[PDB]
Structure 1
Amino acid sequence: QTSAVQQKLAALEKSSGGRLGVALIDTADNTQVLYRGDERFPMCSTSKVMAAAAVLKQSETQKQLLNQPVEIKPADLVNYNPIAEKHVNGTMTLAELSAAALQYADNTAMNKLIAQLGGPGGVTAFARAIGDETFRLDRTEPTLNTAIPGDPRDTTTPRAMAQTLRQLTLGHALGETQRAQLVTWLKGNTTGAASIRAGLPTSWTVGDKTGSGDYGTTNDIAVIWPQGRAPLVLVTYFTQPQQNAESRRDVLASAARIIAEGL
């Protein structure tokens, strides 16, 4: 089958010169609308949601865990550390690290979450534990963002990520307090204004996590509450042929608009 939303997503893709993947879940009627929805895409920073959620899950049994101070040493600093670089030779809590990773895309913070989970395999392990058999996290920051065409490392599919984000933010993969914290974190993201949120009616409330990497990889995953009606989950992944391709957040805004117009 091929819906007219798919016809406009395909044209958007052709216009873009890149590879677009989209997956929407309408919770109201549990319907799904997908474009290259089973192809793999580099997740880039959108993988931080899985790592933050995995640490929240540990916090269900370890009740003070989010309050635990974690040292920031000079050697922990990587390529983009907007919050952590302010605390080197001091400490940050796992809550602070989670907020820095999710809301400011801090790669040092992500690496602290990965370390708390025992390595990238501990993030993948949480994905398998909540039903996601597609997600794979293989590297730490910054190398998980190489987004090399054909490389299965650090990839998921639009379908799998939208199903997972639903479970974490709207379902009960997490404890209620942990889910609420994740939602609070996602809603306060500072990096998404030009991506999914830019394609959506202003009155809709959004939580999202962006991602960016080599090959112009430009991603966003969002939980959407559109006032009146039931929430939506939308993932938009985009990647391009040239390793040094520029960011294309507009494509994600545009995919989101097409998806919103087809409701």
Structure 2
Amino acid sequence: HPETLVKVKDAEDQLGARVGYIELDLNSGKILESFRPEERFPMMSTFKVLLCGAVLSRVDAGQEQLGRRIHYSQNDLVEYSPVTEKHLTDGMTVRELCSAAITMSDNTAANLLLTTIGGPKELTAFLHNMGDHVTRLDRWEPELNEAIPNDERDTTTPAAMATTLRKLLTGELLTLASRQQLIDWMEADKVAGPLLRSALPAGWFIADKSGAGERGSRGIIAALGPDGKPSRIVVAYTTGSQATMDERNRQIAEIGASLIKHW
């Protein structure tokens, strides 16, 4: 809705930075709204959905098993590892690692999963071979969050991200069991509190993945819809703002409000 566009323009003016935005019908694939959909934005932790997407693709091929247990060291623990720091002795399964990566945004869990698939270059190769020749991951956690101006490393466009997410959740790439698993992990997201979920009415379905980085980097990707079933995909990014985390959350929150209001 045009009223959602002005909120994005409102967000742009108040934050003093670019705001990437796109709205996409989950079923048909028709873009309902798009603001700067061809510009690049830092992915931040939103890449962790694409990460486990490649992981599930390997699971389908038999190259990976969700029950496989991975042990790791203390030297592997990077900043913000709320789950993986608790399992140095017993280790964690691939399933548990993806759960920590998508629900808790465990940075160490993400790196461990990246090692399984062959690193960021292989995640980029994965996205490339599913028709996404725009999105690229170059670095590991937490270096991928640097968000240097005009740096195209670890970035994406709202359009590429939205269509990629749709193809993972509902596309022909992954099996039915894996599509359900990925959206289940997203539905159980714990660290997207003051965003789209803040404007989400009761009974509405949401499965998302938020992100935060340096230099005012904020973002979220989500499949949601009323009556407990997802019907649209929403992708929103921003970077460059000197604003606090609080306003960046509330700006994206206000964008979600008009989205719901003019559903």
TM-score by length of 1: 0.93
Equivalent residue for 1:252?
252
Equivalent residue for 1:92?
92
Q: Which amino acid aligns with 1:208?
A: D
Equivalent residue for 1:185?
185
Structure 2 residues not aligned, in runs of 5+: none
Matched residue of 2:37: which SS? coil
Structure 1 residues not aligned, in runs of 5+: none
Q: Which amino acid aligns with 1:108?
A: T
Matched residue of 2:209: which SS? strand
Query: 1:130-187, CA deviations, whole angstroms, 9 ceiling, x for partnerless residues?
Result: 2111110000101000011111000000111111111111223211111110011010
TM-score by length of 2: 0.93
Matched residue of 2:100: which SS? helix
Task: State the identity as a percent.
Answer: 38
Between the aligned partners of 1:90 and 1:230, the Cα distance in structure 2 is 36
The answer to whether 1:231 aligns with 2:218 is: no
Provide closer, same or farther for how the CA distance between residues 86 and 31 of structure 1 changes in structure 2, counting only shifts above 3 A. Answer: same
Between the aligned partners of 1:230 and 1:118, the Cα distance in structure 2 is 32
State the Cα distance separating 1:197 from its structure 2 match.
Answer: 1.4
The equivalences for 1:32-71 within 5 A come to 32=31, 33-62=33-62, 65-71=65-71
Equivalent residue for 1:175?
175
Between the aligned partners of 2:155 and 2:27, the Cα distance in structure 1 is 28
Q: More displaced, 195-204 or 72-81?
A: 195-204
State the Cα distance separating 1:90 from its structure 2 match.
Answer: 3.1
The answer to whether 1:25 aligns with 2:24 is: yes
Matched residue of 1:174: which SS? coil
Between the aligned partners of 1:127 and 1:262, the Cα distance in structure 2 is 32
State the Cα distance separating 1:14 from its structure 2 match.
Answer: 0.8
Equivalent residue for 1:222?
222
State the Cα distance separating 1:5 from its structure 2 match.
Answer: 3.2
The equivalences for 1:104-143 within 5 A come to 104-143=104-143
Q: Is the 8 A contact 2:188 2:207 kept in 1?
A: yes
State the Cα distance separating 1:238 from its structure 2 match.
Answer: 1.5
Alignment RMSD (CA, Å): 1.8
Query: 1:106-140, CA deviations, whole angstroms, 9 ceiling, x for partnerless residues?
Result: 00000011101111111111111221111100001
- Count of residue correspondences: 260
